[PDB]
Design an enzyme around this catalytic site. Sequence first.
Site, PDB file in Angstrom:
ATOM      1  CB  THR D 170      -0.940   0.004   1.200  1.00  0.00           C
ATOM      2  OG1 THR D 170      -0.168  -0.004   2.403  1.00  0.00           O
ATOM      3  CG2 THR D 170      -1.832  -1.219   1.177  1.00  0.00           C
ATOM      4  CD  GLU D 245      12.291 -13.224  33.433  1.00  0.00           C
ATOM      5  OE1 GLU D 245      11.625 -13.949  32.671  1.00  0.00           O
ATOM      6  OE2 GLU D 245      12.303 -13.372  34.674  1.00  0.00           O
TER       7      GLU D 245
END
Lengths: 113, 430, 430, 432, 432
Positions: D170, D245
Site C-alpha cells: 500500500t 527477561e
Amino acid sequence: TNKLLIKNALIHLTLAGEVNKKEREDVFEAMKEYEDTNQMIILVREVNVPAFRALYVVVTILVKKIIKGPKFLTEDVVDVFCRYDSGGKKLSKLSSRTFGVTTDVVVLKSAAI
Amino acid sequence: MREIVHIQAGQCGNQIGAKFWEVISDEHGIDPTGTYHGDSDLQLDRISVYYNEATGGKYVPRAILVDLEPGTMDSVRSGPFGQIFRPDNFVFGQSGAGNNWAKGHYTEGAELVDSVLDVVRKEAESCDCLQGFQLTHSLGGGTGSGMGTLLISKIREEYPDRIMNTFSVVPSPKVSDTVVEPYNATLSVHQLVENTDETYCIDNEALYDICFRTLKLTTPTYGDLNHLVSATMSGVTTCLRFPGQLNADLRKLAVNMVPFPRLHFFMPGFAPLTSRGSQQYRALTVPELTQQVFDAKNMMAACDPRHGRYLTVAAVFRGRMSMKEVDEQMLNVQNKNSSYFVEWIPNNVKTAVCDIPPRGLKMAVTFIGNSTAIQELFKRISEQFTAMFRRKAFLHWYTGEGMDEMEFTEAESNMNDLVSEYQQYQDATA
Amino acid sequence: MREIVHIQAGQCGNQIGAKFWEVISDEHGIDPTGTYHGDSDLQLDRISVYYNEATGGKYVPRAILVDLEPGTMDSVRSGPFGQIFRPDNFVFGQSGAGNNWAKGHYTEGAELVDSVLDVVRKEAESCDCLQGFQLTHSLGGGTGSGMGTLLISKIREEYPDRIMNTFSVVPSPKVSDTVVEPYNATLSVHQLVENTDETYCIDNEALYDICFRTLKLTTPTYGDLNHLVSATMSGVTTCLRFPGQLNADLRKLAVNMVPFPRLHFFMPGFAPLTSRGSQQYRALTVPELTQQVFDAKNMMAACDPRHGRYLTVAAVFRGRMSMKEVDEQMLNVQNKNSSYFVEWIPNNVKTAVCDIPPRGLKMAVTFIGNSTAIQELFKRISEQFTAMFRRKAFLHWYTGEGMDEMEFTEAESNMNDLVSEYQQYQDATA
Amino acid sequence: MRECISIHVGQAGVQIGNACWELYCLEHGIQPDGQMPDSFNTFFSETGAGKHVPRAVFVDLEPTVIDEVRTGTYRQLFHPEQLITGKEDAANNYARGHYTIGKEIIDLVLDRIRKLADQCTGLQGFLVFHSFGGGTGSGFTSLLMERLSVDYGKKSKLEFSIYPAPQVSTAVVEPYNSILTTHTTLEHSDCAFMVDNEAIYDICRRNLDIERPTYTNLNRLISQIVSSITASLRFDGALNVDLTEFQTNLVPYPRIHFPLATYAPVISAEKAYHEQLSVAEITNACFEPANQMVKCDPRHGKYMACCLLYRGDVVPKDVNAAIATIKTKRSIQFVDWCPTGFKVGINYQPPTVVPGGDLAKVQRAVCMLSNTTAIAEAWARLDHKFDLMYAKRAFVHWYVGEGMEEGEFSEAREDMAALEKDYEEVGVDSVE
Amino acid sequence: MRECISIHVGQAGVQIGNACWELYCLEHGIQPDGQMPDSFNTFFSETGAGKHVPRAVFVDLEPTVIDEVRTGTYRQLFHPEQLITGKEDAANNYARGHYTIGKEIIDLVLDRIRKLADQCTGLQGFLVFHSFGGGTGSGFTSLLMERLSVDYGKKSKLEFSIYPAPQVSTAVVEPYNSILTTHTTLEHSDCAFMVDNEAIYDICRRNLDIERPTYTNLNRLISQIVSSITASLRFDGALNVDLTEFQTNLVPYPRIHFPLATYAPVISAEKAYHEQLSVAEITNACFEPANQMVKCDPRHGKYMACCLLYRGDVVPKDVNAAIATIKTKRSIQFVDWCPTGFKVGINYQPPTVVPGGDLAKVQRAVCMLSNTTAIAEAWARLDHKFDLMYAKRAFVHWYVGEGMEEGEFSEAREDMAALEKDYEEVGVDSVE
Ligand SMILES: CC(=O)O[C@H]1C(=O)[C@@]2(C)[C@H]([C@H](OC(=O)c3ccccc3)[C@]3(O)C[C@H](OC(=O)[C@H](O)[C@@H](NC(=O)c4ccccc4)c4ccccc4)C(C)=C1C3(C)C)[C@]1(OC(C)=O)CO[C@@H]1C[C@@H]2O
Ligand SMILES: Nc1nc2c(ncn2[C@@H]2O[C@H](COP(=O)(O)OP(=O)(O)OP(=O)(O)O)[C@@H](O)[C@H]2O)c(=O)[nH]1
Ligand SMILES: Nc1nc2c(ncn2[C@@H]2O[C@H](COP(=O)(O)OP(=O)(O)OP(=O)(O)O)[C@@H](O)[C@H]2O)c(=O)[nH]1
Ligand SMILES: Nc1nc2c(ncn2[C@@H]2O[C@H](COP(=O)(O)OP(=O)(O)O)[C@@H](O)[C@H]2O)c(=O)[nH]1
Ligand SMILES: Nc1nc2c(ncn2[C@@H]2O[C@H](COP(=O)(O)OP(=O)(O)O)[C@@H](O)[C@H]2O)c(=O)[nH]1
Ligand SMILES: [Mg+2]
Ligand SMILES: [Mg+2]
C-alpha cells in the site's frame, strides 16, 4: 508436445500488448526452427508478477539454452515449478519439485544470481 | 484544517466548477442558500476544508472565480448554485481574451492580476493551515491557458512550498475545436512543467466513448461530461476530508506518484459506470470494480494504455469493503498486466480506502494513472506545432501582442526534450 | 464450479438455444425476470454451472449470442425469456452472411471476430473452474457453419485443454432446404474433425417422423422439433449438476466414448415419448423405456442403425429407479443385438443414473449413440459434393470471396478418408 | 507496582492501540468510561477518585485518526492531554517526520512522557506501536528512540513493527522508509517485533474460514499477541516471564534482535469442536509454515533461540513432554552452537474472547517468539528494492529538499550490507 | 489402545463408507451428532468435551458426492478438514488420477493423515476403500499406497476393492483401470479384497426375495462384512483375531494376496422362521456356489487357506464338529501341500440389525475370507479384455496425452503374465 500452451502464454501473461511487439515477434520465428522439440519451458522472474526473461527448450535429461538467462537448469537453482492455467491465465503451482511432461513456468532464485 | 482554495479560470473551468460545487454541496448536504441539511454529522467534522463558515450557520465555498469577459460569470451568477458564492470573489475584466495566449498573459493578464492575488491573500489568511491550491482550466482556450499559467507563475512565487494540482482539459486528437490549440497548449506546457506538482490531464474524445459505449447514452451534453469529471475531482480529496481505514491526502498522492521532477502528468479513471437498465446484470464486487478500470475503454485520456508503460498507479477507492479483497485484486490485475508495468519500480500500486461511498452507490473506485502512454499525446501536439511554424501561420496575432519568435523555438525544443524522457528514461532497465 | 460457457451462433442455433434456456429456467425455478422461484434447494446446489449470479439474487445465463445480421437477435430480445440475457453479450454484425461459407469465415466473419472473443475472455475469467464450451449451430447455413468453426479455430488456439461439444443440425437426406448445403457442410467437417472432442449430429427427417409416429402430432412446428432437441441438451449435463448414484460428466461422456481421435460423431435419442392420450396404455418401467430406445424409429439421426454397427453406447438415465433393472436391461439388449455391436470392444455400454427426473415425468432416458451407421450420411454429402464439383456449379460465389479451388480438393479427400475409417477400422476382427 | 507506558506512533500504531485498549478493559472489567464494577495497576495509574486511566501516548501528525479516538467508543477513557495532534502529516516523506514537522512537537511528547514516567517507581519498559511503511511510523520512532535512549538509556524498549509485506503493498516508497529508519533504530532498540501484513490473511482465510476480513479483524490478532507478552505482569502464574527477561534470553548479539511472533490456536467457533487441543497438539501447530506471521519459510533457516509463553490450564509435565518430541525431529533444525534455545513461561489465565470477534473460546494458548535465521531472506528482499530504485534515483527529490543529504543513501545500505552478512555469519557452524 | 484409520478414495469408497459409518454409530450407541446417551477407542479419537469424531479421511477429486456427505445425515459428525475436495475428477482416465490432478492435492491428504497418526500410539492398520472402475478409484489409490509404504512401510495395509463384474459393466475402459493399477498396487498392498457387483444381485434377489435393490442396499452387505473383520478389535471375544493376524495366515506367497468374502445368514424377515440356523447349517452355506460374492465357481479351483470369523452366540464344540464334516466331503478339495488351511475366530457380539434394512435380526454370523485358486479364471478374463482392446490401440490417446508412455502398456500385462502363471504354479500338486 504442448505447443499451444506456451504460445498462448507468450502473448497473454508474459509479453502482452503494443509495448513489446518488437520483442515477441522476434521470438516467434526464433522457436519456429525449433518446436518439433517435445517440450519447451519459459522463465518467469517472480511469482508476484509474471514477466518474461527467457524461453527454454527441453531436448531428450538436460535443458538446452535458446533465446537472456542461464544456459542449463538444475533442480537446485529453480524455486518453483508451475503450470500454465488456461481458464484464468494464471499459474498453477505444481507440487512436483522435479521436472515433468506438463510443467512450463519456472522461477529462479536470487541466491543463484 | 488543511484548507484548499479553489481557484477557477476560463470559460471551461467555470462551467466545470459550476458542476463541481454541485457535487460537493450534496455530499455535505448543502442547499442553494448555504445552510445545512445533511444527515451525517461526519460531514461537518471536516467542512472547513472547502467551506468557510459565516454568520447564521451559513457556508461559503472557498472559491475564486476569474474571467476576462463578463460572459460566463453572468451565467453562473444567474444559474443554480450561484448565490452560494461570495459576490466579492467574482473577478472579471471587460476586454475579453478571445482565444489568445498572448493577450491572456501580457496584454490583459498582466494588468488584472492584482485584483485576483489580493483576494487570494484574503483567503490564505482565512486558512488555519494552508494545504494546497486547485485550479480548473483548459489548455485549449485563451483565458484558462493564459490567465491560469500566469497565476501559477505568481502563486509558487508567493507560496513556494504548497502543492498545486491543476486540471487541464487536453484537446482531443481527432476533432479540433480551436484553430490555434497547437499554440495555446505548447505555450502552456512550458509554464506548467516547472511550477505544477501534478496535472490531471483529461481528454474529450475518450470521454464521449464512455458516454456512448459504457453509459450507453445518445446525446452527451457538457452537463454530463463535466458531471463525470467532477466525480473524479472529488474522488481525489475525499480520502482527506473523511475517515478511512487507510488515509491519503493530496501530499501522499504527490510523494508516491512523482519519481522525477518533470513526469507528473496523470490520466484518471472512474468506476462503476452502469447504464440505465443494464445496472442489474453485473455484480457489485471488488473483483468487478477493478477489472473495469484496467482496460483501455475507461481511461478519460484519449491515448492507448497498451502503448507505453505504467510507472506509478494509484487506486483511491471509496465505500466500505474488505481489505483482503483489495489486496488480492491489486495483485490479480498486476499479475495479468505484468507485461505492461515497468521493471525498475517494484510494487508500484498505491492504494487508499475511504469509509463513505458516494451518495447513492455502495462502492466506487477512482483511478489515477501515470504512464508513458501520454508520450504520443505530446508527440501529437509537437507535430501540429511543427507544420504551423514552418509556414508561420497565425503568427501576427502573437508577435503584435509583445512576443518573440525565439520563444516559439524555446518551447518546441522544450517539449521534444520531455517526449524523450518518456523514452530515454523509460526503457532503462538495469 | 465446473462452469460451462454456452456460445450460440447462426439462425438455427439461436432458435435452438432460445428454447434451451426455456428448459434450464424451469428445472431450476427461474422466472422470466431472473430471480428464484424453485421449490427444492437441490436446484441451487450447482446453479453456478450456467449462471453468473448478479446482484439482488438475480441470475443471468452464461450465454454468448453471435450473429451477422440483427434479424433473429431482434426476435429473441423481444421474445419470451429475452430480458434474462446480458445486453453486453449480443455481438452482431450488419452485412449478413446469407448462405455463404466463404463470407462468414473470410469476408465478414474474419473482421468482427475479436468483438466476440473479448466477451469470451471476460466470461472465462468469471468462471471459478472452467469445464468446457458448448456451441449450438447448424452445418446447413452460412453463419453457424462459418462463424462457429472460425471460433473453434480460435478457442482451441486459446483454451486447448478443455472440451468442445457442438450441436450441428445435419441436412436431412431426402429434402434439401438449402441449395448449396453440400458446400456449407464439407467445408465445415474439415473444421470439426480436428478441433472438437464430440459432436452431436442431428438430422431433420428423423425428427419429423417422431412427431408423426410416436408423439402422434399433425403439425410439427420448429417450436416442437427443437423442444425435443432441448430435452437432450439438458439430458447430458444433468448428471454434472445433480447428485446421482453413478455420476458422469461432460468428460466421462468423452473418455469412454471416443476410441480413435477422429470418430466422435454421435447420434442422440430420447425416451419416453408418449402421445397426448395414448400415455395410459404403457407401463412406465425400466424394461419398457429401454426397448423403446434401441429400435430404429426413435433415433434423431436419420440413418438406419441396423446398417453398420455400433462401437460404443452411452445410456444416461434420469429419475430414481433400481440399479439391478439397469444392470439387467443393459445386459438384455446386448443379448438380442449381439450381432449389431462390434467384436473388438467388450462391455461396450457406458451407463449413468441421475436422481432427479425431468420436471413432471417419473423417469427418462437420454441415449448417446455412436456407430458406423453414420458412414452413409457422409457418403451422401460427399457424393452430392462430387457431381456439383464436376460441373463446378455455384463456384464463383466462393472464388470471389477469397478462396482457392484447391480447398475443394483438400476437403473432398478428407471426408472420403473418413468414410474409409468407418470401413478400414470397422471389420478388423481378431 | 511495576509499570510500563505505551506509545502509538503513526496510524498503524493508533488503530492497533484502538484494539489493544479495548482488550485490556475487557480482561479486567474496566469500563470504557474508566470505571469498573490490584495486579492491573501496571497499565492504569488511577485517580484517587474512582476511575482508571491508561498509560498511553497517542502521537500523530495528521488529526484524522485522533479525532476518531476522541469521538469513538473510548472517548471517556483517555486523558485528553495524552492525545497529541498535529498540523500536516509527514505523508510518506521520511525527512518530513524526522526533520521538518516532527521536530516542532517533539517537546510536547517528551514532556508528556516525562509526567507519566514519574507517576510510579517501577518504570518497567516501553511499548512502541508503529509500522515501517509510512512517514510517521518509521520517521518519528527513529527520533523518539534517539531521545528516550539518552534520557533513560538503561531501560528496556519494545517495538511492535508492522512489517512491509513481500506481496501486498500500500505504498511506493515502502523501501525508502525502512532502510532509512534501520540506520537509526538499529543501534538504540532492544527487541523489535516483526508482524507481516500478508501472512495474517493466510491465517484469517484458511484457519478461520473468514473470506472477507477487515483491518478490524487483523488488529485483533495482533492485540492478542501483545496481551500475551505482558500477561505475566498482570496475572499470577507458575513460571512468570518479565519484560526485563526478553532482552536477555532472546538477543544473542547486539545486532540480531528481530523475532517473529506466532500464535496458536487460531480456529473458528464451528471448529472449536472436532479436536482435542492438547499441548502436544498446539505446539506442533506453532512449528509449521502454516502458522507463520512473516512470509518466510521457517524450514529454510535455523532457529537460534525460541520462547513459549503458554497460558491457561497448562500441565507443566506435558510441556516437557512436548518439547522433548521437537528436538529429535528431522525438519526443525536449530543452530549447532546453541545447546537448546527454549524458554517457557506458564501463566494461569486462559485468553479472553472479544465479543463480536473471530476467535473461539479456548482454554490454552501460546505466543511463540522466535529469533530465527530465515528472516535474512526478508532482509535480502528490501535490499533488492534499494538496488533497483536507486540506480535510476527514483523519488529522491522529495527527500533531498526536506533536510536530508543524498550521500546518506550510499551509507545506509552498508548498514544493511553488514546486517545481511551477520545472519550468514551466525547461521554457519563454528567447527573445531 | 489399538487404532486404525480409514481412507475412502473414489466415489465407491465414499458411498461404502457412508454405509459403514452408519453402522459403527449404531453398534456403539454413537449418535449421528457424535454424542452418546472404552472398547470403541479404535475408530473415534474423541474430544475432551463430549463428542466422538471418526478416524476417517474422505478424499475425492469431484465435489459432488462430498457435498452429499456435507449435507447428509452425518453432517455434524465429521471434522470438516477431513473432507478433502478437489476441482475436476480424473473421470475414468488413469493418468488423470496419478499424474495430473492427484499430484495437486496429494500433500493435502498426506499431511492430514500426518495429523492423525500422531493421535495414538497403537497405530494398527489402514482401511483404504476404493473401487477399480473410476479414475479416482484405482488411480489415486495407487499413488497413496506408494506414499504410505515409504512413510510407514512396516505397518499393515488393507484394501477393499469393488471388483469389475465379469458380465455386467458400467464403464468402457474398466479393463484399463485395473491392469494399470495392478502394476502399482501389487508390491505395496498386503490383503486386497475383491467384492463383485454382479454376485450381490444374485444374493439380493434370491436369498432375500427383494426384486428391486439399490446401491443403498448393496452397500449394506459390504458394511456388514467390514464390521465382521474389525469386530474383534471393537469387542471382547473368546478367540480374537487381529489385523496383523490376517496378513500372516492368508498370504502364502508375496504375490497371491487376493481373497474374497462370503457371508451367512443372508435371509429375509419372512424366512427368518422355517429353519433353525445351527452353526453346522450355515457353515455349509458358505461353501456353496450360491453364496460366493465373486462370480466364479469355487468348485473349479481349490482353496489354499480359508478363514472363518464367527460371532454372536457360537459354541466352539460344534464349530469343530462343522469343520470335521467339511474335510471329509467330496467336492471341496483343498490343495495337497497345505495340511489344513483353516483359521477360526469366535467372537461374542451378534451382528446388529440396521433399521430400514434388508436382513433380519439373527443370532450369529460368519465372514469366510477364502484365498482360493478359482480367482485365476477371473484374472484370465481381464487379460482377454486387455488384448482385444490393445491390438487396435483403442482409447490410447486419452492416456498418452496425460503423462503416460504407451510402451508401459506392453509391460503391465507382463506383470499379469507372471501372476496368471503363479496360481497355476501353486494350484498344482507337488509330487515326490
Ligand atoms: C400433467 C402432466 O404431467 O403433463 C405432462 C404430460 O402429460 C406429457 C404427456 C408430456 C407433455 O409433452 C408434450 O405434450 C410434448 C409436445 C411436443 C413435444 C414434446 C412433448 C408436456 O407438454 C411436457 C411436460 O414436460 C416437462 O414439464 C418436462 O420438464 C420437460 N419440459 C418441457 O419440455 C417444457 C415444455 C414447455 C415449456 C418449457 C419446457 C422437459 C423434458 C426434458 C428435459 C427438460 C424438460 C409434462 C411432463 C407434461 C406436459 C405439460 C403436457 C410428454 O413430454 C415430455 C417432454 O415430458 C410427451 O410424453 C411425455 C409424457 C408426459 O406425461
Ligand atoms: N496491521 C495493520 N496495519 C495497518 C492497519 N492500517 C494500516 N496499516 C499499515 O500501515 C502502513 C502505513 O503506515 P502509516 O503510519 O499509516 O503512514 P504514515 O504516513 O506514517 O502516517 P499517516 O500518513 O499519518 O497515516 C501500511 O503498511 C498499512 O499496511 C491496520 O489496521 N492494521
Ligand atoms: N458396490 C457398489 N459399487 C458402486 C457404488 N457406487 C458406484 N459403484 C461402482 O463403482 C464403479 C465405478 O467406478 P468409481 O470408482 O466408483 O468411479 P469414481 O469413484 O466416481 O471415480 P471418478 O469418477 O473416475 O473420479 C462401478 O463398477 C459402479 O458399479 C456403490 O454404492 N456400491
Ligand atoms: N469538458 C468540457 N470541456 C469544455 C467545456 N467548455 C469548453 N470546453 C473545452 O474548452 C476548450 C475551449 O476553451 P475555453 O475554456 O472555452 O476558452 P477560454 O475561455 O479562452 O479558456 C475546448 O476544447 C472545449 O471543448 C465544458 O463545459 N466541458
Ligand atoms: N431443428 C431446427 N432446424 C432449424 C431451425 N431453423 C433453421 N433450421 C435449419 O437450419 C438450416 C438452415 O441454416 P440457418 O442456421 O438458418 O442459416 P445460417 O443463419 O446462415 O446459419 C436448415 O437445415 C433448417 O432446417 C430450427 O428452429 N430448428
Ligand atoms: Mg499512518
Ligand atoms: Mg468420481
